[PDB]
């Protein structure tokens, strides 16, 4: 009834989708075959899974996901291994030539090759849906399919589906660590085209979670599997209220209304607490105030933008577990009295609480310790203007000599798009400056 | 020839009787009643076109 469609575009999107659907199967008791372990009656019989898994006439759970990439390696690796019978093969779209870290290749070239098939699969899934809540689109702001095809797909989704929720889960390029070279070019060109065709975009980088895994989890050399497991925990805490009964339920149509103060300001951060291991959780008494202070601590933020440098606009706190609203209220009151956390003057009511009774599940052989309570901390702050300024500085350094422009132009995008995109994010940068006062 | 198995048309390969229709490797594993034959040698042509 509370159906959601998950579109995972790019290698980052597909790997995050692997780590997400593993956790979803562990939550809903689904084997990597699509079947209940017990019969139809015992060990199940509920209909809580219909937000993510549709049910055929025999009782086979198939996910409401569309896996898209232009290279075949990662999608074929999904098709052959572990969850080979769970995922639908027609919902595992892949192409021949990758976009090769190129926004314009993903937007006008091979990205435009596949968008008809992708929209056909999406409209089949939406016709299956009977009360669709929105599209969770997992991608990166890196190169290729995560920028170009994601922006083109969201443009087409805004064209045909109207004002349905289009929540992005976007991997933002970190201030120091970044893999591609043309990544500022792709990020500028994709934020320019996804400023308008978006409702909200949860912004989750890699370096901050690397520091989190070093400092709080003691992995000291984590990997993409750990990163995507934490991102999967984030998206599960966001989507939990649509599947589990709680004191305060939060649906997907609400995040835009409660986190977007002005148009084009739709980039909130993300934080999960308590992200910590077992030998450290043995010595702790983890409670509502402690995990709220951990959320508001400028070290558990999963994007390298410290909130000391800006003002909060909106604050979605998703409490999940055996949490009590009295201690929720006390913790939020003491955060409001705390001075290091700074809220903007035109927003006295800056908090939105969603309480769910389901305790945080744990992946077997995972990284996180099992806790009775967790918070998904989702803040829209002006501290991201620093990241936008740094990325615009990188774009201006790359664009003063206009290196790596001949690729984009010679395979099809006009050069005026670079200038209008930089103008659009300059306008965004001034927008954040004007919002901050 | 006999040895190459190339005298089978598409219609004779696919339009087989429905009682024996789901065959395996283009044959009938259950309809087979001639075993252990000795009379008959394969010549140079038969062994060359096998």
């Amino acid at each position: 009834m509370r159906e959601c469609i998950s579109i995972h575009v790019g290698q980052a999107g597909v790997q995050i989708g692997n780590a997400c659907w593993e956790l979803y199967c562990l939550e809903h008791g689904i084997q990597p075959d699509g079947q209940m372990p017990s019969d139809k009656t015992i060990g199940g019989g509920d209909d809580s899974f219909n937000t993510f898994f549709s049910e055929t006439g025999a009782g086979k759970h198939v996910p409401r996901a569309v896996f898209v990439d232009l290279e075949p390696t990662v999608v074929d690796e999904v098709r052959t291994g572990t969850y080979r019978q769970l995922f639908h093969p027609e919902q595992l779209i892949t192409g021949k030539e990758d976009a090769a870290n190129n926004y314009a290749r993903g937007h006008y070239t091979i990205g435009k090759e596949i968008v008809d098939l992708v929209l056909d699969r999406i409209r089949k899934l939406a016709d299956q849906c009977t009360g669709l809540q929105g599209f969770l689109i997992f991608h990166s702001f890196g190169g290729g399919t995560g920028s170009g095809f994601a922006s083109l797909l969201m443009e087409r989704l805004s064209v045909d589906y109207g004002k349905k929720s289009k929540l992005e889960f976007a991997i933002y390029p970190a201030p120091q660590i970044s893999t591609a070279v043309v990544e500022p070019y792709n990020t500028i060109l994709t934020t320019h085209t996804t400023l308008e065709h978006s409702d909200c975009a949860f912004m989750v980088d890699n370096e901050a979670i690397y520091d989190i895994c070093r400092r709080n989890l003691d992995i000291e050399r984590p990997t993409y599997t750990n990163l995507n497991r934490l991102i999967a925990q984030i998206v599960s805490s966001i989507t939990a209220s649509l599947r589990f009964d709680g004191a305060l339920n939060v649906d997907l149509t609400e995040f835009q209304t409660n986190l977007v103060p002005y148009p084009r300001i739709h980039f909130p951060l993300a934080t999960y607490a308590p992200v910590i291991s077992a030998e450290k959780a043995y010595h702790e008494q983890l409670s509502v105030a402690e995990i709220t202070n951990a959320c508001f601590e400028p070290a558990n933020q999963m994007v390298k933008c410290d909130p000391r440098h800006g003002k909060y606009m909106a604050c979605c706190m998703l409490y999940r577990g055996d949490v009590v609203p009295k201690d929720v209220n006390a913790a939020i009151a003491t955060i409001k009295t705390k001075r290091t956390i700074q809220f903007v003057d035109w927003c006295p009511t800056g908090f939105k609480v969603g309480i769910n009774y389901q305790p945080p599940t744990v992946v077997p052989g995972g990284d996180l310790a099992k806790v009775q309570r967790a918070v998904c901390m989702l803040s829209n702050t002006t501290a991201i203007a620093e990241a936008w300024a740094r990325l615009d500085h990188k774009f201006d350094l790359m664009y003063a000599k206009r290196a790596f422009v001949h690729w984009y132009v010679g395979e099809g995008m006009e050069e005026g798009e670079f200038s209008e995109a930089r103008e659009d994010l300059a306008a965004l940068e001034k927008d954040y400056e004007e919002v901050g006062v | 020839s006999r040895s190459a198995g190339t005298l089978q048309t598409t219609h004779q390969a696919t339009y087989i009787p429905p009682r024996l229709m789901p065959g395996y490797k283009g044959h009938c594993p259950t309809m087979k009643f001639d075993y252990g034959e000795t009379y008959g040698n394969a010549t140079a042509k038969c062994l060359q076109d096998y």
Partner: protein, 54 residues
């Protein structure tokens, strides 16, 4: 509830029959790929050269 259970059992019967038909069809497809549609020439194709001195 009995009608719903009968519908689900009919679906399960269809799944079992389709699984048997699926393994048969996959065997047929692998047969038509790895056999039939291959042309390795035998010795009789090369025997018909250099058999006449004129």
């Amino acid at each position: 509830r009995e009608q719903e259970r009968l519908r689900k059992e009919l679906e399960r019967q269809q799944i079992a029959s389709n699984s048997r038909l699926a393994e048969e069809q996959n065997a047929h497809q692998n047969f038509m790929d790895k056999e039939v549609y291959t042309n390795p020439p035998t010795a009789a194709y090369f025997q018909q050269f250099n058999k006449t001195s004129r």
